[PDB]
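Before a colleague's protein record goes any further, I have to sign it off. Alongside the sequence sits a line of tokens, each denoting a local backbone shape. I want your independent view on whether this chain really folds as the tokens say. Where you disagree with what is written, explain briefly why. This is what I was given:
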Amino acid sequence: ALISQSIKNLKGGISQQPDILRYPDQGSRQVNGWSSETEGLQKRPPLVF
């Protein structure tokens, strides 16, 4: 009861495996994201004309 968890590094991208087998640092859908290391998940760099 009152179980809690926290993940300090979600830089693992996405994973199509069933969530039972998914690693804690893997999402289900990541679009326009940059899984930078040492700075966490970031929005992808802007597109300069």
